[PDB]
User: Fold Formylglycine-generating enzyme from Homo sapiens.
Amino acid sequence: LAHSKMVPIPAGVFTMGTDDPQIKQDGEAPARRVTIDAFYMDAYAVSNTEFEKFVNSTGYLTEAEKFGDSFVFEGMLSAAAPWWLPVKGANWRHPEGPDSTILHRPDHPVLHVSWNDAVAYCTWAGKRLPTEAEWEYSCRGGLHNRLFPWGNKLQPKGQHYANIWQGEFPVTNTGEDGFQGTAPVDAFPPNGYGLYNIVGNAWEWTSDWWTVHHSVEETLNPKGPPSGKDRVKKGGSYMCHRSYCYRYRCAARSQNTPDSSASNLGFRCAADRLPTMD
Ligand SMILES: *[C@@H]1O[C@H](CO)[C@@H](O[C@@H]2O[C@H](CO)[C@@H](O)[C@H](O)[C@H]2NC(C)=O)[C@H](O)[C@H]1NC(C)=O
Ligand SMILES: [Ca+2]
Ligand SMILES: [Ca+2]
Assistant:
C-alpha cells in the first residue's frame, strides 16, 4: 500500500568490504572505512505495480522489450551458465516468457530491468540509484562486520530472514522459506534501518562502475571508478545457495553490462532528500 516509501539512512562511518573475503575474485577485500552522508533509501525494491505506474505515465519500453528477449532461469520454465536461457519475449510483464504474467504477483519485485531501465524509473520518481557504498551501508543495517543484515547466523532463532534457495541447486528448490521464485517486496523481517529483502529475493542495481581493485584509504561518499564496462549489482537472489553461490551477504558483489536483464535482477531507489509527496 506504501511500496514507494523511503526510510532515512543515518549519517555514519562503516567498514565496507571484508578482510575475510568469501568470493575473493569479486574484490570483497580489503575492508575499508567509508563515511556516508545521511540520505534516504526505498524500504522496498521497486515492485511490478510501482514499475507499471512508471510505464503508464511515460510509455517507457524496457531494453528487454526492445531486444525481444531476456535471460530466464531454466528452473522457472513450465548465457552465463547452462541454467540461463535467452527467452524470446521474456520481460518485466512476462517474467518466464510470453505465456507468463505478473497479474498474480503485483507486489513482487520488478524483474528483467536493465541498469538504464532502473535509472529511468528512479529519475522519473524524483530519486536515483544508490551507490555501492550507500547500498552496502544500508544493507548492514547498523551492524559492524556481520555476514548478513541481521547478524552472522543464516536462520536466527530458527526463522528464515531472506528468500534464497533451499535444496540442491539447480534441480530442487524445496521452498522451505516460503517462496520458490520471488516473494512480495514486503516479505521477511526488516533490517535495522527498515529495509525489506535487501539480501535475497532479487539482485539490485547500483550506480557504480565495477572494479575489483579497491584501496584501503578512507573515503567520503565514494562513487566507484570513473569508467568501466559493467555496473555493480548487490544482494543475491532467490536462486542463491551456499553450495555454489553465497552472494546473499552485504559484502558480496557482482556485475553485469548496463543493457543486461534477467529473471532475478531488479533494483531499489535512493535520494539525497525526500522527493515531492505523492
Ligand atoms: C496502468 O494503466 C492500466 C490501463 O489504464 C490500468 O488498468 C486499467 O485500470 C482501470 C481502473 O481500474 C480499469 O477500469 C481497466 O479495466 C484497466 N485496464 C487494464 C487493461 O488492465 C492499470 O491499473 C494501471 N496500473 C497502475 C499500477 O496504475
Ligand atoms: Ca526461497
Ligand atoms: Ca535484494
Observations:
- The longest helix spans residues 48-58.
- The first strand starts at residue 6 and ends at 9.
- The chain has one domain: 1-278.
